[PDB]
UniProtKB/Swiss-Prot annotation, chain B:
This is Spike protein S1. Attaches the virion to the cell membrane by interacting with host receptor, initiating the infection. The major receptor is host ACE2. When S2/S2' has been cleaved, binding to the receptor triggers direct fusion at the cell membrane. When S2/S2' has not been cleaved, binding to the receptor results in internalization of the virus by endocytosis using host TFRC and GRM2 and leading to fusion of the virion membrane with the host endosomal membrane. Alternatively, may use NRP1/NRP2 and integrin as entry receptors. Binds to host ACE2. RBD also interacts with the N-linked glycan on 'Asn-90' of ACE2. Cleavage of S generates a polybasic C-terminal sequence on S1 that binds to host Neuropilin-1 (NRP1) and Neuropilin-2 (NRP2) receptors. Interacts with host integrin alpha-5/beta-1 (ITGA5:ITGB1) and with ACE2 in complex with integrin alpha-5/beta-1 (ITGA5:ITGB1). May interact via cytoplasmic c-terminus with M protein. May interact (via N-terminus) with host bilirubin and biliverdin, thereby preventing antibody binding to the SARS-CoV-2 spike NTD via an allosteric mechanism. The gene is S.
Length: 42, 50
């Protein structure tokens, strides 16, 4: 289950102070075992 | 169920399919075919005294 939110902030004070819910846009029937994750760069 | 279906101005998010009351009774549904938002109200009722 992946929840996403795009909030254009202006303060830039790292994580902002406030509330912003995230909506379940993606759900995948993957059925696998996940323990370690990494990110990808160009 | 049994009730009256009405066109509703409720703003469902695109992933939502239902809408419930305080007592966990459904008061809004989404049409599986035409993707319409239908409010469900109970039919007319009331106490009768003699
Ligand atoms: C997934 O793999 C780990 C080993 O790293 C194991 O302990 C676990 O039982 C497996 N299954 C899960 C997390 O559902
Ligand atoms: C099902 O009904 C909807 C509404 O009439 C229509 O848009 C859709 O194409 C239909 N699907 C199929 C597979 O016929």
């Amino acid at each position: 289950k992946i929840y996403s939110k795009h909030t254009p902030i202006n303060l830039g004070r790292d994580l902002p102070q406030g509330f912003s819910a995230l909506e379940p846009l993606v759900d995948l029937p993957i059925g696998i075992n996940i323990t370690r994750f990494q990110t990808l760069l160009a | 169920g049994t009730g009256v279906l009405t066109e509703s101005n409720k703003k469902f998010l695109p992933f939502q399919q239902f809408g419930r009351d305080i007592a966990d009774t459904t008061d809004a549904v989404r049409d599986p075919q035409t993707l319409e938002i239908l409010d469900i109200t109970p039919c007319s009722f009331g106490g009768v005294s003699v």
